[PDB]
Structure formats: C-alpha cells, structure tokens
Design an enzyme around this catalytic site. Structure first.
Site, PDB file in Angstrom:
ATOM      1  N   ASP B  32       0.817  -1.221   0.000  1.00  0.00           N
ATOM      2  CA  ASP B  32       0.000   0.000   0.000  1.00  0.00           C
ATOM      3  C   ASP B  32       0.846   1.264   0.000  1.00  0.00           C
ATOM      4  OD1 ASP B  32      -2.289   1.599   0.098  1.00  0.00           O
ATOM      5  OD2 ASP B  32      -2.544   1.376   2.284  1.00  0.00           O
ATOM      6  N   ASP B 220      -1.839   5.447  -5.762  1.00  0.00           N
ATOM      7  CA  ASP B 220      -2.099   4.511  -4.657  1.00  0.00           C
ATOM      8  C   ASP B 220      -2.253   3.073  -5.075  1.00  0.00           C
ATOM      9  OD1 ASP B 220      -2.660   3.332  -2.288  1.00  0.00           O
ATOM     10  OD2 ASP B 220      -4.572   4.357  -1.955  1.00  0.00           O
TER      11      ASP B 220
END
Lengths: 4, 339
Positions: B32, B220
């Site tokens: 992440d 992201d």
C-alpha cells in the site's frame, strides 16, 4: 477498496 | 542494493508475503503506497462482521522472542471506512530473505480488512493520532526507512510493476528499477504533498476530448479504481455514459453498461510532457450479475489506483520526493539496477  | 518482491494480484488488491518475528511467521499483506504503517492480523483477532480476516496469515506475538511492546494504542481508518485497531510493537521483519530488526509494526486484534497491510508511504502519513487530534505515539521509521538505515537498500525508493490486468503476479523492487519494463524514458515528477504520494495531473483525455484538471493525484497501489472530485467525475461521466447510483445512504457509485465500447483509451497528462495511456477495459468493472461499475468514482480525494497504475512503470523516490513514470511494457525480460 481504498487504502489513508 | 535491491530487493525484488512478488506481488500477488488478488483482484481488488496486490499483496506480498512478509515474515514477522524470531520465528519468521509468514503474513500475506497488501502492498500500500497510500498508507504508511505495517500491521498484522493477530492470531487472536476478531474479524469484523462478514470478514474472513484470518485466512492470509496471522501473527502470534507470544511465540516471537524478539517482540517488544511499545505500550501505545493503534487505530487506523482507511478511505473506504474500513478500520483496524490494536497496539504498537517492534519485531524483526523479513522480506524475500532480507531481515530488518526492531521494525515498528501494529499488532491488530480487531479489523474489518481481509488481511494485514504493509504501508510504504511517507512517515508523515503514519496513523499515530486519535480522534481528539492529538498524537498518541510519535512518528517513526516505517519499513522503507528501516531498509535504508540498516543498509539493505541505498535510497528510500521502490519500483512498482503491477503488471497487466490478466497477470497473476507483478513485482515491487525496493531500492531498484527494472529498465526492461517501460517504453520511453522515466520522467521524474515532483511529489506535491509532504504527506501523500501525489503528483500533479494536468488533464484527462477521454473519448478524444480533453478535460483540464491541474491538481494532485495520489498514486495509490492500495486503491482498486480511480477517484476524482465529484464535479470533475460528473463531467467525465457525461462524456463516458456512466450513471451515478445511490447504493447506500451516503455512498454514490458510477455504473456503466457492461456492453459499453471499450476500444478506446483514456490518457493522463502529467508534468514535463509525461503521458500515461490506459485501455478503456479498465473502466468497466464486472460485478458478476450483469451490472458493471465504472472505473472512475467520486470522492473529495483524487486517487489513481490500480486500474491506472497497471499501465505505468513507477519509481517512487521518497528521499528525492519524486515519482518517475513511463508507459509500461509488459515483459518477462528484466534489466535490474540498484537505485
């Protein structure tokens, strides 16, 4: 999903 | 030096195997770039209602001789409303055989996420505050910082290759780059926030028409789709034929006809002439029931998630505050260099  | 780590394409997320503790307990955790904390599912955790959270590895702190309790509460809330909570600790973290000692992590005992998350963003985005707005534990060296400080990589930097939509696996390289996996030159873009991995997105060309943007976009890995501010998303939806649907009290999602023409491409224009093109298949997300989500969705936050990132090779450089981008080239050929 969407991680902050 | 460099550390190549396989990314498993799980569908909504990309994950990797990462071991924790003296006894190298394997966790399968989401990679992440949109968060900065590494948390693991405690073997005694309670999963949220309807959530299978113990099927991707768990961590038993009491079986690790090296686990240290920091005596501080952990809480995080993600953009989609999911949460995890637990306590802060330190232990050995092992990534493809390379071990770092005394890495601060959270031992999570309640979560609505399916698996742990390895947040690799800036230290300034660590979830170290409570709902009062007070910081409850200090900012700390997260995994990429620790890899640098312990001599495992030269620079706090990583390359992201999610690979194609059909691929089973991709690769993240800490401290390195694979120069075989893009066409053109990697173009360095300045990061536009000290907290978030955002670069400036000048415009989007959709169905041949340009739509001016000129604000930061978060790159992201931990978001599935692409999010734009409501007004801009609505302009794009009018061009695309997407339909805004109220799916719950305060959630709205764009749907699109599953038979929509996806022969075209959507183009994203960034600084210094850089361009990334995305095939329009990435904007029709099958729900499995004859309905489809659009691949663009409304939010106050701008996020280019996996349906964008699959089409770029990215070198994130957190020391330089740049993210270098190029049009991806899908190939098993490899030419790896340290950065």
């Amino acid at each position: 999903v969407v991680f902050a | 030096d460099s550390i190549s780590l396989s990314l498993i394409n799980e569908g909504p997320s990309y994950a990797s195997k990462v071991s924790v503790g003296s006894n190298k307990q394997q966790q399968t955790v989401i990679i992440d770039t949109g968060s900065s904390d590494f948390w693991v599912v405690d073997s005694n955790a309670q999963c949220g209602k309807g959530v299978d959270c113990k099927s991707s590895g768990t961590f038993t702190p009491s079986s690790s001789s090296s686990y240290k309790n920091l005596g501080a509460a952990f809480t995080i809330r993600y953009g989609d409303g999911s949460t995890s909570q637990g306590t802060w600790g330190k232990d050995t973290v092992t990534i493809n055989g390379v071990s770092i000692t005394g890495q601060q992590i959270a031992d999570v005992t309640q979560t609505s996420v399916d698996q742990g998350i390895l947040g690799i963003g800036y230290t300034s985005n660590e979830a170290v505050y409570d709902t009062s707005g007070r910081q409850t534990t200090p900012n700390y060296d997260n995994v990429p910082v620790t890899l640098k400080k312990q001599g495992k990589i030269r620079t706090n930097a990583y390359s992201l290759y999610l690979n194609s939509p059909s691929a089973e696996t991709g690769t993240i390289i800490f401290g390195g780059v694979d120069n075989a996996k893009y066409s053109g030159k990697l173009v360095a873009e300045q990061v536009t926030s000290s907290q978030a991995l955002t670069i400036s997105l000048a415009s989007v060309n959709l169905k041949g028409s340009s739509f001016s943007f000129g604000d930061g976009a978060l790159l992201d890995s931990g978001t599935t789709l692409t999010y734009f501010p409501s007004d801009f998303a609505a302009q794009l939806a009018d061009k695309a034929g997407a339909r805004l649907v109220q799916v719950a009290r305060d959630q709205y999602l764009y749907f699109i006809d599953c038979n929509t023409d996806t022969s075209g491409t959507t183009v994203f224009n960034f600084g210094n002439g850089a361009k990334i093109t995305v095939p329009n298949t990435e904007y029709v997300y099958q729900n499995g029931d004859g309905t489809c989500l659009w691949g663009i969705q409304p939010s106050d936050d701008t996020i280019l998630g996996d349906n964008f990132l699959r089409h770029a090779y990215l070198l994130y450089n957190l020391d330089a505050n740049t993210i270098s981008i190029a049009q991806v080239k899908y190939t098993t050929d490899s030419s790896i260099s340290a950065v």
